[PDB]
């Protein structure tokens, strides 16, 4: 769609935040023939996908990011930039750890010959160590009405927690604790007793819609260089501007209530025909002008609050003999998903030294604790996953170095009844627009959600071209 | 053809005989040269002093052998195949003398007849084992050609573990099937081999149905092909071993030099010999071409075919093939019951496949017969004793083939050559060549049909090269 | 903007040249050779004893501008061993004796040629010289339109019409006809001889001859392959094209190889001999004028004989020799003329056996016997048919029953341009429309002309690539 029409006069759109939402807004506005001015607060691109190179030349990330087959807007973007080969697709499997049997792992293998949802049904049927046959029947009974259900049905489930809905549908409490604790922490870094059922249903839709919807991929290197730079190069080649260390301090308003300019941290005033806030909901809420604060659209945002998360990186002296070229569900009380980045990531490949990147969730009682306290808790959990290779007192494998990245306000906490509060990309303020994973879009608080919100934002701006050009 | 091609074929096995048959049908002149004084190759048989036949192997014809069915029909010898009951009879190693079977109902179509057979059988698989086995195999049977080719990287034992098929099922059922198809255990055999064999059970209704030839293969099967080739102007010559592939200065074939020095020439040349013999006869100037260099992976597997004539007629026998489920033996049959020409009402003869034979091809005939009698004492405990206390051996025949069919180990499929070689005028035939029906009689016949097809496709280029 | 992927069938001089100039233009050629040797009709093979034997005795001329350019571009000019500016002919009437046409290096063209004929007294009488000069003067003064008009006559026919004595046609032109197309003047087109005689009047050293310093696959074909590969091009041996698979509109879908492999590109080139192309032309193309005309162009039989003798011949030349034999054409002592084939105590004779129509079917021993009988006339005090004198250590007989197209009269309108009426399909080879005959120069020029036509159609070939992508 972002090819049609060539503007008489291109719009100058000021975008606050160069995360995937801001980068996507800038990409599709540039494709439409407009001039985006992307202003990033930090000295790094990507936001919640940002990474940094330390003194030894090793990268550490904000988080462990997994790309799914059921990410259509991400697939389109990678294809449009011709970087499809930068996604390292792994085996169609879901490998889970055994808390009862340390060092042992169980898995759900999706046959490449069976279509969706048969490959999924088969994976559950074939697995014998994570679910009993009666549990499998009760689980299938509980989920069948949900999978047959439409979009109206999944929206109606936003009033329940995962634990609440599973009990109502008769799904055994052991299934919710065995399988769904892992899935809840993976999607929103919180347990099923807090997470909205609508979140799990959009995730389970990956398993029944497309055949490879639930198939996983790792980026071949650090996201700022391998993903963010191709978008920046594309935006700049079409006349767009991308500026780092440009934090917006204030949204200055005209007497009628519309935006006058975006005042930067050094006082610099940036103007445009349209203004976009592609910042996280927490930062936007603090920067909303007093005169907007009582408008329903901005007042509803009080429900959407960032969830704490910690991303731990540990470089070991040895190469671990028992590892996978995949993502692993630790099924730990302290950890969520983890991966041996020296095996899964191309740019992070090392044949004699293995690095483990792990998501530490729930992180509410841990974001305040010291890095050594977090590493100790991680090593204690790793001694359960690698009992013959990793010991907490470094008796076996030894830590060369570590990197603990804390995000106390990451993605919005997808608790029940957040969906009516989620704003559309077009705001009731003429000339002001919103972008970000938290905005109204159907693919959760994810990389796909961020990119889609950007596409939806750019779409709303080009739709209002006539009104935005006359206002200039 | 304006002018018929003279095609020189080396080896009168089923591949060479098939190449000659279909080239003669196309109106060309095949010259089939056989090294030995017998036709058939790995299906060859010999008549001893007492007038009794002994074979290279126990051969079973399947319903899922379309090119074999076509050939028999074309020669009008369909009645020479003795189709047995649609059953799979297996011995019980734990219960000596006892047998279990998978009966395929003739009213149920494929794969329902198969599903029923497994469901009905209660002594070879437990109900949980049946479920895990069905789960493990269902994605595979639904899979296409690209899927089965992707399984060539795994052994049978490896793939069964991955798909969650119980280890007891792999040891109970698949040891028997692996030794039957390629004379090796599932820890060595490629999974692609088992998947092509299991496709017999789900494609056609009678695909897994078995048949015995009504007599010795040289007379009952090879002679009808020879008579057909000769009636259309083709030549079939025994005791004509090719000693050398003589080349022209450009690298193409000049002639085939025989053992007595005789030079045989043609417009096209075919090698329908086993891969082991071809590898030794490849000229030095061809040896580094990918097509011929890849052949190093394909090596013949040892096998032994034992024949034992007993003084009595065994009271407990079948008009069928039996899976011994032995560590030394593979499939066996009472040929005095199953084969028409070998029928004897007072004297029963047992033809048994001795596999794996790696540690046995070097051993003496008496050592092999002793091991066979010790295994027969487990299958017939009230009729056969190793010290000949019960039934007594009148005579025996031990036929050893130390390099039979290629050992279908994982990753052999990319090495398998097409019937058309990169050398202009030179072609290959044989069960080892690129064809979808394994190293079998069907594979041999299909490779022959595919070879003859490639020669007639290149008629224009082969006729111009002659002048 | 985006380099074209051009699939070329055949790594002869035409295919190698097409690949070389497409790589120079910044495109990606994929050169597929059917055999395990490069060069085609210039291919050679090393036997067990380490001695090379060739498809033919190849002579490079000064009047080969595209060959000179290629050698210069690859920096291998020193690989051509230029011989004396002479034309040495044998005397059939006087066995062992030789006559020659010496071209003075002080006289320019065609004066050096006129002088050579005037100075020679044993091959032409003074009246014969006058009648020959009279008969040829209108022809040498004539333009390109004139030489094309002579394609309707045989050499024997035109010589009789222009009043050139019948003895001149039999003495001088039998040798020249067999040298250029391995056929006698009663069959060869006069246009062929006129393009050859143009070597003698255009450039001073046009008629000067050179031998390659070694085997052509290593000394000439490898430098081209190394150059193509260094610029991103692909060269693959044992890749015979089995079928030209077509799209529903008639254009090429892919080239199907002998091992089943399907090779695709933005453009497709057939640098194969005309005989092989004619057999591979799809049925739907067979009635198009361009491909139907090719029925006239048929490969001519030729035999290249190599004989290694026990002794080094005392009476030999560091040159090419015209045997003026009824069975043989040109010959050379390769132990003298070729650098890599040099041997001081053992001499090797490489001889062209033409006309070969009645000989390609005969045995190697039958051919060697006929060659030894003819060599007993050229070396009567050194070689005897019953090996009484010099003895054969070994021999190599290379038969090409369909070599260069038989340049009989009226073949010129049938010769195709490098750009075919099929969009994306192109032709290369000595038989295609180019002015330097069925020669090494013709092959290289056709390659240059093919690569030129492909780069000229870059815009149309790049757009067609993306239209199919949709
Ligand atoms: C530990 C972790 C693991 C994750 N795993 C996955 C996964 O497996 N799969 C998946 O799909 N998603 C995953 N995500 C989520 C994903 O990272 C986010 O959904 C997405 O990147 C958010 O996009 P965004 O553009 O809306 O916000 P952000 O990426 O956070 O971008 C906002 C940007 O605005 C900038 N900014 C802030 N204030 C200002 C200001 N005043 N002026 C200017 N700029 C400003 C920020 O610096 C930032 O660059 C994970 C996230 C984390 C933290
Ligand atoms: C014990 C045993 C049991 C078997 N059971 C079965 C079964 O149940 N079902 C089934 O389908 N298949 C079975 N087979 C396999 C089957 O026999 C073969 O797949 C098939 O016969 C091989 O065909 P072929 O023509 O390619 O090779 P071959 O039959 O081996 O033919 C090659 C021929 O070339 C000849 N030759 C060799 N060297 C030269 C030379 N230099 N010059 C000229 N001729 C030469 C040989 O003498 C031989 O006749 C069995 C094989 C064995 C040994
Ligand atoms: C005896 C002899 C003497 C000669 N003397 C001279 C001389 O003195 N001077 C001179 O200038 N010229 C001479 N020539 C002629 C010269 O060799 C040719 O004119 C020239 O080499 C032909 O070039 P070409 O590339 O078009 O064809 P070729 O060199 O014949 O190349 C065609 C190539 O295509 C390959 N091919 C065929 N089919 C397929 C397929 N299906 N798929 C893929 N590849 C395929 C062939 O293997 C070959 O390599 C002589 C030739 C001979 C035989
Ligand atoms: C912060 N959002 C995230 C974070 N992780 N995953 C995720 C990663 C791996 C595995 C899974 C799961 F399979 F559980 F769905 C989800 C997401 O799908 C989303 Cl939407
Ligand atoms: C040497 N090849 C062989 C040898 N035997 N059988 C065979 C014979 C009897 C039973 C079975 C089985 F039922 F196991 F497939 C296979 C083959 O199907 C092939 Cl392909
Ligand atoms: C097959 N083509 C050939 C073959 N040989 N010569 C050739 C070689 C030596 C001498 C002469 C002659 F002097 F006669 F022209 C021609 C050619 O000029 C061409 Cl075009």
XYZ file of C-alpha atoms and ligand atoms in Angstrom, chain B residues 9-18 33-44 55-62 65 68 180-181 183 200 211 237 239-244 257-259 271-275 277-278 281 301 303-305 321 331 351-354 399 401 403-405 429-433 437-445 447, ligand 2:
138
model
C 25.179 -55.149 -22.576
C 27.593 -56.571 -19.913
C 25.750 -58.937 -17.539
C 22.587 -61.047 -17.938
C 21.036 -60.422 -14.517
C 17.475 -59.040 -14.257
C 18.818 -55.521 -15.152
C 20.689 -56.732 -18.274
C 17.837 -59.062 -19.325
C 15.336 -56.175 -18.852
C 27.050 -60.881 -22.758
C 26.965 -62.999 -19.558
C 30.242 -63.898 -17.750
C 28.962 -67.239 -16.341
C 27.291 -70.422 -17.720
C 24.009 -69.396 -15.954
C 21.425 -66.581 -16.417
C 19.968 -64.353 -13.677
C 22.939 -63.208 -11.629
C 21.757 -62.855 -8.035
C 18.607 -64.900 -9.030
C 20.694 -67.716 -10.713
C 19.478 -70.934 -5.651
C 21.661 -67.815 -5.069
C 18.829 -66.600 -2.799
C 15.265 -66.914 -1.459
C 13.382 -64.458 -3.675
C 9.968 -63.000 -2.855
C 7.866 -61.080 -5.385
C 5.562 -58.369 -3.999
C 6.452 -54.537 -7.861
C 7.953 -56.999 -12.528
C 14.830 -59.130 5.036
C 15.436 -56.043 2.831
C 20.684 -58.494 5.129
C 3.933 -51.308 0.099
C 4.624 -64.582 -4.203
C 25.732 -65.162 -25.111
C 30.604 -67.436 -20.859
C 31.377 -63.912 -22.240
C 33.139 -62.056 -19.368
C 34.227 -58.462 -20.103
C 37.940 -58.109 -19.171
C 38.388 -54.438 -20.192
C 37.374 -56.691 -24.639
C 36.329 -60.215 -23.504
C 38.415 -62.645 -21.375
C 27.154 -52.172 -17.918
C 24.425 -54.214 -16.143
C 27.029 -55.778 -13.837
C 27.040 -55.325 -9.947
C 28.578 -51.991 -8.729
C 32.580 -55.377 -10.665
C 31.984 -52.036 -12.512
C 36.585 -52.186 -14.619
C 26.882 -56.696 1.405
C 24.854 -62.910 2.309
C 24.561 -66.754 2.483
C 21.652 -68.878 1.144
C 7.666 -67.208 3.924
C 13.709 -65.208 6.211
C 15.773 -72.653 1.978
C 17.062 -70.088 4.541
C 18.783 -66.659 4.252
C 21.797 -66.473 6.645
C 25.585 -70.527 -1.715
C 27.581 -64.130 -2.125
C 29.318 -58.897 -2.350
C 25.587 -59.088 -3.201
C 23.281 -55.991 -3.225
C 21.850 -50.706 -15.476
C 21.382 -52.565 -12.177
C 19.469 -52.451 -8.877
C 22.171 -50.038 -7.453
C 21.422 -47.329 -10.137
C 12.310 -49.529 -5.660
C 15.486 -50.416 -3.577
C 18.199 -53.026 -4.354
C 15.562 -55.592 -5.421
C 14.337 -57.654 -8.415
C 11.896 -54.760 -9.109
C 14.802 -52.290 -8.890
C 16.853 -54.405 -11.324
C 13.959 -54.673 -13.882
C 16.755 -49.884 -13.986
C 20.123 -64.088 -0.769
C 19.370 -63.143 -1.669
C 18.010 -62.945 -1.452
C 17.295 -61.986 -2.172
N 15.926 -61.870 -1.951
C 15.252 -61.016 -2.678
C 13.801 -60.949 -2.497
O 13.146 -61.596 -1.674
N 13.174 -60.032 -3.325
C 13.806 -59.207 -4.259
O 13.131 -58.409 -4.918
N 15.165 -59.279 -4.422
C 15.854 -60.139 -3.674
N 17.209 -60.233 -3.857
C 17.935 -59.244 -4.671
C 17.933 -59.505 -6.168
O 18.488 -60.793 -6.432
C 18.776 -58.442 -6.871
O 18.336 -57.149 -6.467
C 18.772 -58.477 -8.399
O 18.646 -59.810 -8.895
C 20.027 -57.831 -8.932
O 19.855 -57.543 -10.324
P 21.020 -57.021 -11.243
O 20.687 -57.385 -12.633
O 21.174 -55.518 -11.137
O 22.397 -57.702 -10.815
P 22.875 -59.214 -10.971
O 21.683 -60.090 -10.854
O 23.911 -59.574 -9.926
O 23.496 -59.306 -12.424
C 24.825 -58.957 -12.851
C 25.282 -59.985 -13.853
O 26.519 -59.541 -14.447
C 27.353 -60.663 -14.612
N 28.733 -60.209 -14.741
C 29.599 -59.875 -13.736
N 30.774 -59.468 -14.153
C 30.675 -59.550 -15.534
C 31.587 -59.260 -16.569
N 32.810 -58.768 -16.364
N 31.174 -59.454 -17.843
C 29.936 -59.910 -18.058
N 28.992 -60.217 -17.165
C 29.425 -60.008 -15.911
C 27.067 -61.543 -13.407
O 27.516 -62.872 -13.635
C 25.547 -61.392 -13.301
O 24.859 -62.381 -14.056
C 17.966 -61.197 -3.128
C 19.328 -61.406 -3.363
C 20.033 -62.381 -2.664
C 21.472 -62.643 -3.029
